[PDB]
Ligand binder design. Structure first.
Ligand SMILES: CC1=C(/C=C/C(C)=C/C=C/C(C)=C/C(=O)O)C(C)(C)CCC1
Length: 137
């Protein structure tokens, strides 16, 4: 699969509820939700090696990983974690996260290239899922 692109959002669902599970208080959630409405996602892929940059007005992240090799990043609410991405299937990667310290909801994220040329991202916290869809600019 070729995840590479400058991806523009066309749909966002359930981010506020994700943040509620993660315990983000009401006024911070309001800020986060507004900014996360227009995120820019840049992906560069070379085989099973990836770079992903996510940009919003209130948070920008960059990660580098190889599928099947543990790495460190943060949860969406900003807690450090150890992560491991696996191919769930040919066009879909799944990242399991384990907190470095403390206890919290079980979190993960996924990226899938859909047959229409678009990209589905999910983020999960326990049972609750946020779904975003993108198309290249
Ligand atoms: C949660 C949260 C915040 C905002 C986070 C945002 C805006 C995340 C966007 C993530 C995306 C957009 C990820 C992706 O799609 O890969 C701020 C900074 C207010 C601090 C309080 C907790």
């Amino acid at each position: 699969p070729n995840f590479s692109g400058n991806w523009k959002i066309i749909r966002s669902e359930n981010f506020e509820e994700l943040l509620k599970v993660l315990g983000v208080n009401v006024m911070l959630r309001k800020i986060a939700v507004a900014a996360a409405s227009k995120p820019a996602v840049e992906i560069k892929q070379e085989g099973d090696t990836f770079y992903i940059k996510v940009s919003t007005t209130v948070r920008t992240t960059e990660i580098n990983f190889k599928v099947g090799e543990e790495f460190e990043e943060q949860t969406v609410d900003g807690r450090p974690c150890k992560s491991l991405v696996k191919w769930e299937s040919e066009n879909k990667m799944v990242c399991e996260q384990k907190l470095l310290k403390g206890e919290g909801p079980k979190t993960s994220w996924t990226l899938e290239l859909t047959n229409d040329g678009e990209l589905i991202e999910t983020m999960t916290a326990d049972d609750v899922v946020c779904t975003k869809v993108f198309v290249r600019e």
